[PDB]
Each structure stands twice: as structure tokens, then as C-alpha cells.
């Protein structure tokens, strides 16, 4: 590759060597484990850069990571890109065979695997190819990542390619019958960087990253780059700390003893924080957590606004940067009480700088933003995945009508505010309406003797796909499918026949199947019970 | 695309329209249930394309079938290439999960199965994606196909385009974690099929397929194009009868009432044939049946003989057209009795024209034809996949060297002939030296009390991969592994350790593994025990 | 040139070195000259390009052959194509100007040329240029060529190049003024052999080729490649003969000492043959000669068939590979007596796998297949020139229409046989039909006092170009004209007024111009009498 000056490329190495602010001193902290400043940071990046070069890493290759948050991750999220390779982030939360699957499909050259996680690999070592080395990682001195650092020089030079060479992948379930494979490049990396940092930085008061900041990663970091979050924390020079296991007690205690500032996680972490009893006597009034993993509930956020925590919540959906919206008060939003706080801070939001975001019908139609009038968000952005890798027709329908589609049912605000009501395949279709069934599920779990519910659609010939729904009783309860008929028929103001209360069919089930990350199966019960 | 008409592209509607002999009044017969001339042939050929082109099947597009030998299938084998689709061949005998991921794999748009073949699909059906039409088949009136070619005219113009552009795919288990895709263009199954042609058409008086032949294919026809017979018998203008699901007892009347000459089946069917009752008393001396699944034995070929059967082998492996080698007895080897008949008849054979087929080792040395040197095979044909469908490394395993790599291990003699001794993964690494694990399995076989054996390596330090024998017992039957050890102690002539014979290390084992196809795990074994 | 493996050519290097049979052992034999087994021939194929290559011969480099059949020719068949120059083939029955006019238009860089035809050169020697050496020819120790092989090895290295290099040229008179250029290149010739063997070589037990059957060409082997027979027979292995000099006792002494068992002559040397009183004696019933020279009759193949001779014909014209068509006779047409058994024999032959072969009118309207309305016949198959070399007008009327036009007016049965009437432009044109002018000839020839008969014709306003014959009378007779008008008035059953009987002006002539090779000059006529 030759490369005239002039012509700049986006690349991470700019984003870790030219940075908005650079301190030597500042240190990176593996919990309890390690801690070393920035200079050795960077000294290690160059290190792994020549352990890669020397196991025979080339430009095209793809090295596959698998393991918690720690500094071995944020020095896997700078050199194997640096380098020109490809790095897959393995979802360690899936079954083995989906792992097995996607292995296959990247065709990974060199796997670096922390140690706990080797009885997965166990059982589905013998059925992988196309792999040279495993590398295991370790939380002591035995650690052969750091074995392979030590006998390394500090310098490297790092080569300059174009910035649409791609940088990391990963996979997604979604709704298909195999993991889904997304890719971004160095340019698109950077400019979502540049773009979150634009948006969530310039902030008056309120919900804002700063150089003053101390980061720490609650979200799997595997997923969706973590909310990109350590590539703009390195480039702000903040300390970073990284908890490794998300033990509730080891969290709240690095939060109470690094004086952490800034923070992401998902609604269940944060609510098992929250009612842990070592919180019930430690600050909070410096946190400003970000909910970004599904639907963070107005009880979370009230709750969480009575310990003075600046929580608000973001959109992100692993084909999509992830960045899309979040949430932001303007200076007459922050003097409401904590009823109207928790009412905005629980939305999707507005979204950041150069992203479009229309809603829209299967007509393309561009429905109105009304604030009532729900449809499907189509986005347009520059860190949006341009296909997915090695597929065709689903590559066609991620990409149709010129936008792409997230598969999510909302109505946008004439401010801007967007409300995410539901998911489109979710979307029953009774005569020629569509209501959101996770409304009715909210209802149904409104009833005191309720545990869990879920509702779905079933075929009808005048009235198309009519609800159902499934319900899980609690601890010696036992009440009959018409009392939950009836308690749902009680409330008032919806549109269909009266309040379209005549066909809930509720049904109590003893368990409800989940997927193995913790999701409703709705789509397995579309299969059991119809 | 635009074509000189000087410029001659060999495609497979030349194959159908200009064929070596086309009589009118000659009859494709489905067994018992349809039977029509090679006019209504044609016809319904080209009611199937006009057929395929109103459900918006395109040059690109993949249509997928799943059902048995049948008239259905040859026309599938025809209308689906010139329309410029690719036909892809499904593998009944593969796993739900197999299947479903070859179907994901190749991205089929129209799936035609079978009836009895629907509660496959109904465990997949969900996770299925990219199919917008199902055609279910039937032996009965009732079927979809045939109420589909009704509706069409009998008029269609078939288009003219590249003789590159793929025609066939089907899926290959192998030793691979997942299936992997060999496909094939219009020219290569051209030039197979007249290669082949020239090769057997032209022997003087033994195993030679004329125009006087009436065919019937014994082989699953999935698998291997039923090794190319389908294509070359539409060209000879023959009689072609398709028995459907492979009952012995079908098959016997099928040969009886419709004179069969030519046919190609597997050791088991053929055993089944020889050993049914009903063929004891029925003539057989006009029968040239070839023997290609694998490894054709010496005793079975034998009892066949005694019968007046033209009994031969042939070799071809699924992603070399497949025919490669096919025996060939000369006029001096025709008057030699049973014994030396079923000597030769049982062996890999001598290449077929326009196949190089060269002995080689690691280091591509090229070993000579001596007669008892083995190596690995490596060819060079006019109809090799060029790699597997979206495959990268085992692509580059595939043609490493310059050469296709079979992974089988056999011996050339000076003459030509080819004996194949083992797998390149079943060889076992005994010091310096590799010695075959078929041998050893034979020869613990012919113990009186043994049902079944598999041998395997296990490693050692100092004498490397060494080996390990699974029998067994018969009913009633309790020898000791020291009796086993004794008696292939008691064999002599072979290399290595006086006989090799301190480290048979034979177990006893109620069962053994097995595919889903019928083939013994070694690989899980491998597993298993060590 | 590079190429990956992956890619095939179809080269003439394959043909011989990727046989469907081999045998060491098999020789090539030139009557009582030379002997020597399969060995030896590919030994001096590689000196022979050894000597080539050290003479400076490149791979656009053209050498010029010019003698008898035998093993050097069929050496110079394979090893002048195979190092990539052309092997340009000479005429040597041609004018010394046109044979001269060949050799400056081709522009041959080496002449091999035999001893007895040195006197033809020496009188063009001083208009040759660009020819830099003389191989001169012999029969005994003292031949070049000979002298040439021994200085070299029998080692060599033959490359691969693409497919569509030119191998071969000849040059055809025809109708045109100067001979015109026609060339193949390997693919074709390669894809000739595999046609051709696949066609002849399936027949069930009538006129095919197998691995059993001795050859020898009676064809001068410089005209059409020999119909490609040389190349067939050595990719079988078989033994092959070559005479010399086509004397009547030295072919008959060959066919019974060597066994001949296949052949392919004219009927001007099959006569001979069989008038011979050597002949008288001798054994024919193993021997299968083809007729190809041009209009087999029924009377020399009937007195053929009294022989137990398997004499049948076929098809091809020098721009087209050379073969279309042969006859094949099916297993009912064999039960049918001598006079059926000529009448189908003697047809020109239904055609070969992979040709077209529609019959047209000016309008390219392609006229039905009848059995009676004949048109001209035109052709598309993978062995066809695509046009004159260094010739441009002359390649568009080639192939005008989009087909390659034979020149060779003929009627098809609805079967599939093909019976050729006469020439295109010997198709005389009497008001709006056209009635050919071997029938004429050939009831002009019945006449007891008749010799020889040429039917041309002449102008004539209102009914267009009407007939006239010219007739030369035998020994001691004179007819006079009114006599051949009134035996040709005699006739019955044809078309046009009456019988077409007012206007065939025969005419007595003690002689009638032939061309060089011994064909009627119809055109010098045109010439000469109108």
C-alpha cells in the first residue's frame, strides 16, 4: 500500500497515538490483579504487535478472543486492528455449538482463551480446524499472554493501509437460525468515536463524559464493543478499571475505592447493585451509569434516582455502531420532580449527530412523528454495518428501501424523543391494526399473583393474529384464567373491539422457555403451542 | 450475454438435444407407477422450465430437491442447469441439523421434497430461512410437480451463456467439523460425461456400457450425480428405469420384467441381491454392475462371479466428478478362473482418460510404481471442484502442492493398477513408517468369534502413534483379549517389530460408533478412549 | 504464460500423455521399414522436440510436412502441436504454383518434406523465402529426420499454454480461386477425438471403434488429419500400421499379415482393392473400412458387402472437424438382406454427438425433415473453423445466417438420416425449382455406350438456367445425341414439365477437363462452353 501524505486515513492508531489528551501517569487498573500507567499500556501494545508479528499474523488474518474485561481486552481492542488483522469478539454466553458455528464461519487463526472458559472449548476442540495456536490466559503469573509479552521489544512501527480495511466482527442471534456476522472498519470505529464524543461531551450539565472521568465497564464488553466506550476513554486519557467476574460486592467496592465516575451496564446488574446491603451506606452522587442493554423500567430509574445516580439509558442494537440515541435533559428538564424524571430518563431518546432515523411503514411511507403513530425505525448512519458477512438475502432485507432496518416498532415525538414500543416480528396484527403485546404483558404482570408472562399471536381467518397469553404463577397462588381475564378487561382506553378484550386467552404455564442469555422464546412457543 | 455463434460453449442442453442416439419411441419407466417415451421426456422438460420461470426462479437462483430415484429427478437434473440455475442435491441420510445447515449454507430459494420426507422438514422448519416455495412430490395424482408442469406449454427456448457458470452443488461430510460444498460447471459434467464415455464405451468385450444397455440407478443419486450414469444414458439414448426406495424384492422383479444390463450400486445392496431367496432362481448373466461406494471385497465379488455377473469396481470421491479409475480387463485376463478374476475386479482400477494420478508423500516426492510403496493420491482431472464453496483454508489444504488431494493412501502397480490401502487419518505413525489400519481390522475379522473391529493410534513416546483394536463379540461368545492378541501374533510377513506385534493392545467393546451414513467414528473415538 | 492448476486445458499433450489406454508393449509399424513399440514413440515424440527447439522453432512458429503416411508424420502429428507452433500439412496432389502459394500465404518456417517429392520443389525452390531449413525424408538409414532424433534426449519438459492455440492447418481449394486456410486448435482437436470416440465406440456390435482393433489409414493423412483417426487410435492404444505409398498388394499383403481390422479409404482405392485378384483368396470378414471420400455407391458397397466387409460411410468437408456424420445401423436394420443392407450403408449417416445439422433454404427458413425437400446444409459443432485464414469476405459468406455453410445440397428423413443430392452452386436453376445434376449424370451414365457424363447449365430467359450434358463415348461407339435424349426421355417420375425433358442438350465430347486431385471441372465448362 502506498500512501501520499496528503491523503489522511482514519485508523485506530491515530485514535490511540493522537488522542484528545494524553497523561503518562494515568494508570490502567485490572481489579485487585494489576495496575500500570499509560507508558506501559502503550508498551505492551507494541509488545503484542511483535508476539502477533512473530506467530505469523498477516494483514488478512483474524484472531479470536474470548475472555472477561481487563487490560488484556483493551490491548486486544488496539494492536490486532493496529496490525491489520481482524478482531472477533466470541460471545461467551452462548451454547457451544453456536460458538463451534461461528469459529468456523470467521475461520479464526489464533485463539486467545481465558482459563475458566477451556471446559467449553473442550467439548468442541476436537471438531475445530483452521486453528494454529491457543493461547490461555491467566489472572496470575502463569498467564502465557504475558509469557508471550515478555520476550518482545517495546518498539514497533505500525503500517499505514486505507481505513476501510475492516477491523472487528462479531456475531449476533436476532431472529435467523444462525449467528449473524457484523464487521466495521477502522474508519467507521473512528468516527463513531469522534460522533459519541461530539454528542455526549458538549452536554451543559447533565449526563456528560469529560477528561475528569474514571471509566469502568459493566456491559460484556464482547457485544458491542462495549458502547464503544474504551476506545473513547482511552482517547479522553481517563483512568480506566476493569472488574473482570461483575461480582455485585467486588463492583460496589471498586466503585467505592477507585472512585469510579462513569459507567454502563444492563437493567438486572444495576437492580441487583442497587438492592445489594454493602450499597445501602455508600455514595452514589458521582455515578452517571448508561442503560443500554433492554428497556430500562421507570421503577429501576425512580429507584435509582433516589440515590442521586445520573442514570439514562441508550439505544444500540449490534448492526448499528451500536450508538444510535440517548437520552439528554435540557436545563428546564432537570427542575422536574422525580415522577417526570424517570419518565424521560426511561425513553430511547433523541438521536446523536449524523444519524437519521425515520419511522416508517412496510411501504416505506415515512409516518408522521405525532407522538402516537408507531412504525419501524429505519437509520442512516456512518458506523452502520454494510451487510452481513458470507450472507445474501438477508444481507437484502437488513438493507431494504435504501435504509437499515432495526426491527423495532416506535413513535417519535414532534421534540424528538423516541419511544421504543415494540419488536416487528412481535407485532400481532388484529384486523388491521398492530398492537404491541409488551404493553399487555406489562398489564397481565400488573396483578398480584403473577410471575412472569408473554404474549403471542395465533392464525384466526376474520381477525387475523389474535393474542395469547402465558402466564407463570407465584408461590402458592392459584387463580383461574378468567380472573386474569377479567382483571385485564378492567382497564380502560385502547382502540379495537371496546378495549380488544375478547380474546387474551391467557394460559398458565409452569415455566416459560428462555434463550441462553435470558430472553423470552417467543418464537419456540409460536412452535410448541401453535 | 452475448455469443458468436463460431464460439461453441459446452453446456448441458446440448447434452439433452444433441445426444449420441435420440430415439422417440424409447420409454423412461418409473418403477410400476409412470412410464412414458423420451418425447413426453423432453416435453415435460420443457413444461418445467416454463414452470420454474413463472415462479421467479432466475440465472442466478438455487432450487433444492430431496426425494429418491425417480423421473422427477432426471428431469431435475436437466430443466434446473439450462434455465442457468444450480441445482442442489440434498443428502436424505444426513442429520436434521446437517441438513438445515446446508440448506443456510447454500441459500436455497425453492425447496421440491418428497412426502415421506416431510417430518424432516417439520423439525427444521422454523429455523429455516431464504425458501419462499415448497413443492411437495408424490407417487399419486395428488402430487404438486405434475399439477405444476400441467398448467405450462411444452414450448420453451433455452438460453445460451457461459459453460462456466455452476450447475450442480451438493455437500460433503468428510473429516471436516461441518459440510463442506463442492460445486461443478456446465463443461466439467460435459466433459465427464463424454471422457467417461470414450473410456468404458470402448472396451472390447467386458464391462462396457453401448447403446443397446437398459440402465437403473442402485445409488442414492444425491451423492455423487450417481456417478455421472444419469447424464451419459440420456446421451446414449437408452432405456432408464428407476426403481424408487431400493426394496431388494422390487429391485429383483425390476431386473427380472424390465431386462436391466447396466446398473451401479454398494457392497450392501449387492450383498442384499445375492443373499434374497427370490434370486436364487433367477437368470443374472447380462447384469454389468459396478461397485463404487467403497471398497469392493474380494468374497463378495467372488459370489457374485459364480452368478455370471459382470461384477467391477470404480473410485470417485465427491469432489472429482467423481469417476477417477474404473477396472479394465484386458483379453488375457479374461480366461483366468475365479480366483484371479475377483483379484483384479476388486481393485481401484486404472485411471479413466484425461486423469494423471500421481503417488506422492508429504514433500511431494512422487514416489514410484513399484507395487508396494504407498502414498497419498493426488489427480489432476478436467471435472475437479476448484475449492469448497465459501472456504478458505481447507480450499488451500484441497489443492496444496498444485495437485487435488484425495486423502487416500494406496499403491500403483507397473501395469496401472491402483490399490488403495487405507485414509491418509487412518494411517498410525508407528516410529518411522506408516502401516495400514485396514489390514489389521481383516485380519482380527477373521477371527470365528469376532463381529466387528476398528483400530486406531494412540500416541507413545518413543514409537509414536501406535496402535488399538476395538472388537466385538458375537452372540455368546467370550474370548480374552490375550486370545486376540495370540492370534494376530500368530500371522507373519510385515515389517516393523518382529510383526508389529507388542502393542495390538485389543479391547473389548459391546458397540461401536457409527455416522449417520453407516461408517465407523474413528475420530470419535479418538475421542472417546483416548 | 501462467496458469493454476485448478484451471484445465484441453491440449493434444493430453491426449497422448493421458490415454484411455496405454500399453508399453503395443507397437507402431511401417510396412517391412520400421518397428517399434509405444515406448520408443513417445521417446522420439520428446527428441523430435528436442531436435525442434535446438533449430530455433518457437511457439508461433509454423512447420511445414509434406509425405506419405508414417510413424513420422504421426510423430510430427504430436510433437510440432505440443512445443506450440503449427503444424501446417501440404497438400502434395496440388499444382507446384498452389502448393507454392500455400507455403508463402501459411509462411512456414521449416519444410520437412519426403526424397521423391524433392523434384516438385526444385522447380519452386527459388521463389520460396522465409524458410530457413530442408529436412529431407527417406526410407532407409540415410534420412535427416533420423540423423536429427539421435543427436538429442528423450527427456523433455512439454508446457502448458491455453486451449486455444492453433495446432493444426491445411489448405482446401473448393470453389474459390486460390486455396483457402482453415486451422484448429488443441481444444477442438481434443474435443473432436472425445466426440467422435463416444459416438462410434458406443455402437452395440456394428462399425465401432474399440481397444481390440488394429488401424491403418488409406487416406493421405495430409487432407482432413486422417479424420482424425491417427489421434483416435493412439488415445487407444492400439496397433497402428502405416503403408506408404497406397499400392493395391502391398495394402492387401499388409491387411493379411498385420490383422487389420479398421480403416478408412476412397472408393476409387476400395475398388482396386477388391478387383485385385490377390484379393480373390483372402479373407475380409474382420475389417471395417469407412468410406469417406465422397458418394460411397450402392453397386461398389453391395460387391462389398458380398465380402462380409463392414463398409459404411461418412461425412465431413474439410472446414468441420472433418466428421458430421456416419451411418449407424440399429439391431433390426442388420437382419435385412444386401440390397436394404446398401441402400443404408450409403447414405451419408445421421450425425455425430454435439452437431446441429439443419437443412435451409437462401431465407435461412429450414425446411422441414420430410424426407424429399432438399436444402443446404448447415451446421453447429465444437470442432469448426471460425473462418479463412487472412481472408475476410470469404469467412462472412462462411458463416452467413449464424451457421456454417457446407455447400452441400441434401434431404433429412424424419429418423434422422441424412442423404446429400448435390452441391449448392451445381444446383441448377429452372424456372422456381432446383433439380440436381447427379441424378442426370447418373442416368446418363446407365447407357451401355457411356463413359463419363458432366450436367451443367446455361442460361435462358424464360425458364432460367436450364440443363446440358456432355458425354464421352467408349471404345468403337457412336450414339448420336438424339439416341441419349430419347433414353433419357424414356424416364419417368419427376417433376417440372413432363419429365423435364425438352432441354438437355447433350452433347458428345471425346474428353472432359478434371482437376489436379481428379474431380470434374463443372466450372472451367461454365467456361468453356458458355
Redesign the interface.
Given at each position: 500500500y502506498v500512501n501520499d501524505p496528503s491523503n489522511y486515513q482514519l485508523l485506530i492508531k491515530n485514535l490511540l497515538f493522537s488522542p484528545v489528551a494524553f497523561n503518562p501517569e494515568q494508570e490502567i487498573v485490572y481489579a485487585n490483579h494489576r495496575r500500570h500507567s499509560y507508558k506501559t499500556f502503550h508498551d505492551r501494545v507494541r509488545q503484542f504487535a511483535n508476539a502477533l508479528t512473530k506467530m505469523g499474523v498477516k494483514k488478512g488474518d483474524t484472531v479470536a478472543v474470548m475472555d472477561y474485561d481487563s487490560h488484556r481486552y483493551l490491548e486486544c481492542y488496539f494492536a490486532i486492528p493496529m496490525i491489520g488483522a481482524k478482531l472477533h469478539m466470541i460471545n461467551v454466553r452462548l451454547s457451544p455449538e453456536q460458538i463451534?458455528?461461528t469459529i468456523?464461519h470467521a475461520?479464526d487463526d489464533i485463539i486467545l482463551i481465558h482459563e475458566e472458559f477451556l471446559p467449553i472449548l473442550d467439548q468442541i476442540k476436537?471438531?475445530?480446524?483452521?486453528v494454529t495456536r491457543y493461547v490461555v490466559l491467566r489472572d496470575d503469573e502463569e498467564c502465557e499472554y504475558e509469557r508471550l509479552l515478555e520476550q518482545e521489544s517495546t518498539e514497533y512501527n505500525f503500517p499505514d493501509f486505507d481505513e476501510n480495511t475492516v477491523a472487528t466482527t462479531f456475531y449476533t442471534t436476532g431472529t435467523?437460525?444462525?449467528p449473524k456476522g457484523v464487521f466495521f472498519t477502522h474508519r467507521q470505529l473512528v468516527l463513531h468515536t469522534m460522533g459519541i464524543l461530539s454528542t455526549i461531551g458538549t452536554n451543559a450539565s447533565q449526563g456528560r463524559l469529560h477528561q475528569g472521568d474514571i471509566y469502568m465497564p459493566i456491559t460484556p464488553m464482547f457485544h458491542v464493543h462495549a458502547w464503544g466506550l474504551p476506545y473513547m476513554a482511552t482517547m479522553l486519557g481517563v483512568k480506566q478499571v476493569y472488574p473482570g467476574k461483575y461480582v455485585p460486592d467486588v463492583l460496589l467496592n471498586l466503585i467505592e475505592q477507585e472512585k469510579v465516575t462513569f459507567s454502563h451496564c444492563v437493567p438486572t446488574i444495576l437492580h441487583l447493585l442497587l438492592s445489594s446491603p454493602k450499597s445501602k451506606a455508600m455514595d452514589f452522587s458521582g455515578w452517571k451509569v448508561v442503560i443500554g442493554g433492554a428497556a430500562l423500567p421507570k421503577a429501576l430509574c425512580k429507584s435509582a434516582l433516589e440515590r442521586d445516580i445520573d442514570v439514562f439509558a441508550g439505544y444500540g442494537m449490534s448492526e448499528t455502531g451500536p450508538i444510535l440515541s440517548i437520552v439528554q435533559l435540557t436545563p428546564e428538564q432537570l427542575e422536574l420532580d422525580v415522577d417526570q424524571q424517570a419518565e424521560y430518563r426511561s425513553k430511547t431518546g433523541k438521536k446523536v449527530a449524523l444519524v437519521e432515523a425515520y419511522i416508517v411503514d412496510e411501504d416505506m411511507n415515512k409516518l408522521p412523528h405525532d407522538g402516537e403513530t408507531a412504525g419501524e425505525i429505519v437509520v442512516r448512519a456512518p458506523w452502520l454495518t454494510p451487510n452481513y458477512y458470507?450472507?445474501?438475502?438477508?444481507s437484502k432485507a437488513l438493507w431494504r428501501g435504501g435504509y437499515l432496518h432495526t426491527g423495532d416498532v416506535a413513535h417519535i415525538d414532534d421534540e424528538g424523543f423516541i419511544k421504543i414500543t415494540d419488536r416487528v416480528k412481535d407485532m400481532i396484527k388484529i384486523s388491521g391494526e398492530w398492537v404491541s403485546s409488551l404493553e399487555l404483558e406489562d398489564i397481565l404482570h400488573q396483578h398480584q399473583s403473577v410471575s412472569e408472562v408473554a404474549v403471542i399471536g395465533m392464525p384466526h381467518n376474520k381477525w387475523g393474529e389474535v393474542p395469547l397469553a402465558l402466564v407463570t404463577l407465584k408461590e402458592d397462588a392459584q387463580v383461574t384464567e378468567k380472573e386474569l381475564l377479567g382483571f385485564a378487561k378492567d382497564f380502560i382506553n385502547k382502540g379495537i373491539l371496546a378495549r380488544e378484550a375478547l380474546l387474551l386467552k391467557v394460559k398458565i404455564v409452569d415455566e416459560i422457555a428462555k434463550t441462553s442469555v435470558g430472553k423470552v422464546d417467543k418464537?419456540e412457543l409460536?412452535?410448541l403451542h401453535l
Open positions: 463451534l458455528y468456523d475461520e476436537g471438531r475445530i480446524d483452521t435467523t437460525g444462525f458470507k450472507d445474501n438475502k438477508n418464537k409460536r412452535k
